[PDB]
Amino acid sequence: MIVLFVDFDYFYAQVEEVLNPSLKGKPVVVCVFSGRFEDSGAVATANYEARKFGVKAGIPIVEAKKILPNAVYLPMRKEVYQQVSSRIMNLLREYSEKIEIASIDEAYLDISDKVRDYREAYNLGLEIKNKILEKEKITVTVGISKNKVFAKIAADMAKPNGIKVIDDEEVKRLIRELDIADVPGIGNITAEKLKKLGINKLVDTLSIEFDKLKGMIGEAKAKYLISLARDEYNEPIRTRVRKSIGRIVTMKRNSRNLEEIKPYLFRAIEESYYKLDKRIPKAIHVVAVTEDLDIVSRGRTFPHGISKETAYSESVKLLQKILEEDERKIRRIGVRFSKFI
DNA sequence: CTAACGGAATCCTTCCCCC
DNA sequence: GGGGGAAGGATTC
Ligand SMILES: Nc1ccn([C@H]2C[C@H](O)[C@@H](COP(=O)(O)OP(=O)(O)OP(=O)(O)O)O2)c(=O)n1
Ligand SMILES: [Ca+2]
Ligand SMILES: [Ca+2]
Ligand SMILES: [Ca+2]
Numbered sequence: 001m002i003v004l005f006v007d008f009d010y011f012y013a014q015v016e017e018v019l020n021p022s023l024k025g026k027p028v029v030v031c032v033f034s035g036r037f038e039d040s041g042a043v044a045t046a047n048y049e050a051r052k053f054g055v056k057a058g059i060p061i062v063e064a065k066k067i068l069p070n071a072v073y074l075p076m077r078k079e080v081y082q083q084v085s086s087r088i089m090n091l092l093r094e095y096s097e098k099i100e101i102a103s104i105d106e107a108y109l110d111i112s113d114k115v116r117d118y119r120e121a122y123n124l125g126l127e128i129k130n131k132i133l134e135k136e137k138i139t140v141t142v143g144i145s146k147n148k149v150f151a152k153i154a155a156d157m158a159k160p161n162g163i164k165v166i167d168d169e170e171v172k173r174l175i176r177e178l179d180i181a182d183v184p185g186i187g188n189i190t191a192e193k194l195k196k197l198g199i200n201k202l203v204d205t206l207s208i209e210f211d212k213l214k215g216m217i218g219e220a221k222a223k224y225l226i227s228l229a230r231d232e233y234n235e236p237i238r239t240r241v242r243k244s245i246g247r248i249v250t251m252k253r254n255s256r257n258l259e260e261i262k263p264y265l266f267r268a269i270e271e272s273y274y275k276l277d278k279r280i281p282k283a284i285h286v287v288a289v290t291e292d293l294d295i296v297s298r299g300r301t302f303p304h305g306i307s308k309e310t311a312y313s314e315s316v317k318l319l320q321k322i323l324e325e326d327e328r329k330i331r332r333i334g335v336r337f338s339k340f341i
Numbered sequence: 342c343t344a345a346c347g348g349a350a351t352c353c354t355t356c357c358c359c360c
Numbered sequence: 361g362g363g364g365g366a367a368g369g370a371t372t373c
Contacts, residue, residue: 011373037343044347045373057373060346076347103350103373185352187371220353221370246349252342285367293346299366332348354369360362 001112001234002121005143005151006092006128008085008105009161013047015084016074018137025049027071031061034250039065044076048160088136095128100148100237108148110237118144118165125163146171147233152184175202175229185224190217202229247272248287248334256329258320265319268334269311280305281337286318289332298322301339311335 008014012030017023027050033041039061046055046064050071055064061073085104093099098110115121125142132138142163143155150166153174158164166174180202181191193216199205205213205225214222227233247268255261265286283301290296298321300314315335322330 032347034347035343036346040344040346042347058347062345078348105373185371189370218354240351242350244350248348250347253344295368297367301365334348336349348373350373351371352369353371355367356365358363358365360364 001110001146001236002115002118003145003148003151003237004096004109004111004121004125004128005148005155006107006109007141007143007152007155007159008088009139009141009159010045010047010051011085011105011138012045012076012078012081013050014138015081016077017047018084019080023072027053027055027068029055029061029064029068029071029073030076031064031073032076033061036250036252046071084136084138088132088138091131091135092128095124098237099239101240106152108151108237118167122163122165125165129163148235148237149184149228149233150174153178153182156182171231175231178202180204180225183225183228185221190221193217205229243340244336244338245272245275245281246285246287246334246336247275248289248332248336250332251330254291254329254331256323258316258323261319261330261333262316264333265315265335266312269308269315272335272337273308273311276337279340282306282339282341283337284311284314284318285336285338286315286322287334287336288319288322288326288330290326290328291331292328293331294328296322296326296328297336298325305341306337311337 013028016028029046029050030044031041032044041061043057043059043064045057050068053067055067089101089107092107092109096109096111100108111121111124115124121144125144129140132140139161141155141159143151145151145154145166150171154164154166180186180194180200206229249264249268251264283299284306285297285299287297298318300318
């Protein structure tokens with residue numbers, strides 16, 4: 001195949017720069033405020049001016065303000081970024097009917113029936129970049145290869161506003177030389193257990209027997225890495241459909257009293273049913289983050305659709321099921337609806 | 342009422358009822 | 361032995 005992958009460069013921060021061009025060239029930090037104390041939260045993303053000094057996603061806001069006290073700390077307007085994302089995704093549909101929208105800033109395009117060789121695909125990536133830069137003024141990164149994995153790897157390399165094509169020969173040397181921690185789907189928990197087995201490259205998974213690797217990362221993760229190592233990975237581009245919608249808020253204080261959690265729980269249901277917008281769900285899940293950021297969830301599925309009033313009375317029973325089966329105090333409480341019609 | 346941490350999705354793994 | 365569902369986990373954005 002020939003897969004064209006698009007990744008929006010610092011999406012949340014760049015959209016804020018488009019709406020306010022005076023922020024250009026200045027370190028911008030898009031923050032997610034929680035509401036406990038002031039400056040409590042994490043960094044959603046930051047532009048490359050702020051990311052030079054280590055201000056990247058995940059770090060707390062207070063820790064980022066000690067590195068860059070004079071930076072622009074804007075609240076996260078996710079809906080504004082979603083509207084911009086939606087308009088850009090419609091621009092990509094003109095180039096391929098087979099499109100796979102991964103996240104809010106990632107989209108896979110199967111251009112196997114639109115270009116001949118990789119050079120023509122490279123020219124198509126330039127045409128796509130110059131089109132998003134024209135209509136929406138957003139710089140993106142294009143990664144082109146033979147499957148979805150290496151297309152994302154090609155974009156991860158020439159990340160800041162670039163375009164990279166990994167031909168069939170560079171794929172061969174990457175199976176032998178690329179660090180396996182930089183493979184999509186390989187986080188710290190599994191990458192550490194691969195070094196325990198002595199696997200630092202993709203080709204290492206072909207020497208170790210299957211069950212030795214199967215018992216440490218699982219059957220799916222084992223067959224997935226071996227598929228990439230054998231140069232036999234070719235999962236097709238598929239249209240993704242949202243399978244769940246959730247909203248979870250942070251309470252003012254850690255509490256186990258039911259009547260104190262119900263306002264936050266009912267607040268999540270209102271904001272969750274608003275984000276539903278048609279689509280009647282058949283299951284409701286009450287999600288509670290414990291005192292030490294551990295996740296607990298008690299679900300419930302119905303043979304019919306769930307109404308707003310039903311989600312109200314049923315979430316209380318699911319919430320009580322959490323307090324009866326867990327002694328830790330709750331930090332965040334929320335609701336996730338799945339199994340649509 | 343301002344305290345060492347956000348919110349939101351996905352697929353996979355384990356455990357267990359069940360044919 | 362395997363299908364299929366609830367709850368936890370790892371991943372990534
Ligand atoms: N832990 C994270 C990581 C990312 N995001 C959001 C902010 C980003 O704008 C978007 C995509 O993040 P990327 O991982 O693609 O990183 P950026 O797009 O911010 O920059 P770059 O693509 O250069 O890494 O998702 C988030 O909320 N939380
Ligand atoms: Ca991305
Ligand atoms: Ca990006
Ligand atoms: Ca990684």
